[PDB]
Write a protein that binds this DNA or RNA. Sequence first.
DNA 1: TGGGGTCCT
DNA 2: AGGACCC
DNA 3: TGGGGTCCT
DNA 4: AGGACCC
Lengths: 367, 367
Amino acid sequence: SSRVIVHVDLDCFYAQVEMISNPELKDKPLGVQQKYLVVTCNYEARKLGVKKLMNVRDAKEKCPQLVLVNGEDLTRYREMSYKVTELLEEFSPVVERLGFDENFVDLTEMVEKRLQQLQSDELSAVTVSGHVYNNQSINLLDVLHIRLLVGSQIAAEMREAMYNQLGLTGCAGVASNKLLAKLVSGVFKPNQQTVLLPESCQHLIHSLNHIKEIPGIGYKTAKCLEALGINSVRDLQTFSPKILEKELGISVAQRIQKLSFGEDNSPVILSGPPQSFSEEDSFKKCSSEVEAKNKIEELLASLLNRVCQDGRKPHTVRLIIRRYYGRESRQCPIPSHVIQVMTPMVDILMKLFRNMTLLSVCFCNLK
Amino acid sequence: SSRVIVHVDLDCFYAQVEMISNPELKDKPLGVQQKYLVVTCNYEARKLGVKKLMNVRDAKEKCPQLVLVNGEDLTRYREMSYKVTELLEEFSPVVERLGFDENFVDLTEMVEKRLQQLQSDELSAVTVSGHVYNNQSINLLDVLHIRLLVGSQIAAEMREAMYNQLGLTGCAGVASNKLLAKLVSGVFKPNQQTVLLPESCQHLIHSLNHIKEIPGIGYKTAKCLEALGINSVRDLQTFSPKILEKELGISVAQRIQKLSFGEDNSPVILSGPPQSFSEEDSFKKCSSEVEAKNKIEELLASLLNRVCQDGRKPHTVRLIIRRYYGRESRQCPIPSHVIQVMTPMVDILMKLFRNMTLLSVCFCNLK
DNA sequence: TGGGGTCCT
DNA sequence: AGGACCC
DNA sequence: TGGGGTCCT
DNA sequence: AGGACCC
């Protein structure tokens, strides 16, 4: 029943991609910006206060030496993202993407195939590659420890190949399910890896400071957990199954309570090609109304080329909005013959507009 | 590009299935009932006024000689339904179900495979099997007429095999798309078949008396069409694309307007095994409230056995309701280990009940 | 106006 | 989750 | 608080 | 269609 999962997490991904394109930014503290935000920055900058998602100003007045590059156009990041995934796919086919810079790979079959290949002998010489989560002692006679170590060896090879073939660094974490692998991948933050032995599971999960830090617990369930008194991971573990059942509903509840013990049975799912391609414009005050379909000609132009390329054709169009959490969409089929340019598409987007701080087009339901 | 589609439509299906089970009903006018309704009756009864979906009383006082059988339990009808479909599948694999008693089969490849097998000779001796829609003359030199005739030959073989192997009669209609095949299957009503030549398409579509008779136009779009003045099929054909576009939305509108010309590009889709299994109880006044989960133990019992059997296991449960058009549901996952009896299931159905004229359970999302 | 079932938003 | 379609 | 993306109800 | 999650 037991699995060996690796979580691969690329360091400051857009900044890496930009640092490869312009090497005069390598030494220099680098911010990648979108509108008013600094969405990511390389190491040099991070250390001098720049962070997470700061202002192009609250972030410049915490570091004047800031280089900025625009990363609103996601194209190159998207391409390198799939290069990474394809590369992990070549190790083992079942790879799951999470955003552009994370991948889970189920290494179970591969770890076993290596283990069967060793003679009862070199097995005593199995070693770990990278850190062991809470500096825990390894027991070479524990079959689960041996498998996880062989998994940390695959992980280090994924990272070496990602570096040698694509020029990217990143972290990895090896554990027995996706929750834990992703929790432990970030213990040694910059370009390192960690393996979690079973005995330190509670240590890792109790090292969290709030239940929002558990992947799967979002902005909204966390506010509901709070309203109940639940704040630490231990409060969640010990809370009444009943009340939570009856309050977040059986599904959400009996799932996030397992997560609070480090238990998570969800399989790594094969992502394969994307289910949709969409593009957005942000702009606060700026869409008057009707005139700003011009906007609508551009996301199309961009998208059309991308949609093209993949080969597969979209059979659904969608348009999205906000005014001054709440966004609206209208969907419709894409007329069959127009599948097989812009012209009629703009038109069907323009009643999808009229039946109805930002605008987007999505191509969904590819075939 | 051109297709040959057959629509197979079983005569008074539940009554046939019951007439096979109890032959002392064969001569006798037979109603199959559910609650207060006579949902179907065989020929003998139909002719003496009994119809469609009448009262067990407004229908008995239009015919006192009525035998009634209960057909609330859909089990045997459901089994014979799939026997029919499997039998048509053996002619050509792409068969689409519509309710328990209709199937579309795309005969295009099969008609061509027969045509290639004939020598330039016997081709002049191709004949039709059954009626030609508006008594239209056949042109043996028209390649579309020849294909449709070979399609009426496949149809007659489907009907003979359905009769010889399963003991069921029914109608068939052969045409160039599903709209037309289904429109023309019912021209000769009891146990006969009709083939539609292209030149009589407008005749058939204008023989309709209201646009609700066009398959795809339902209760709600028909009321909207009315509100616009649109009543005949010809009003719909001639109505402003624009207004209708802008009023039912581009998708519904540009689709039902094509239908009003007899044009319909939708493929016959392979139904294969069912996407869900559900059971219902009706009862007006009767669910007090909480106590009537007892109800909830039964639909389960029934369902569990069925779900079992198919082999494939449901990963989603759902519960449905109405109070005194509008029904409510709550869905949730089925706990993994309980996939692999009743006990915990009733329980997860009973919070799905408490977060919340009739009740039902659905097993969906089989795997 | 039963007792099913499918796909779309 | 709910609407809309079909039998 | 960008500019993407996925699955569920 | 909209909510909820993740990066």
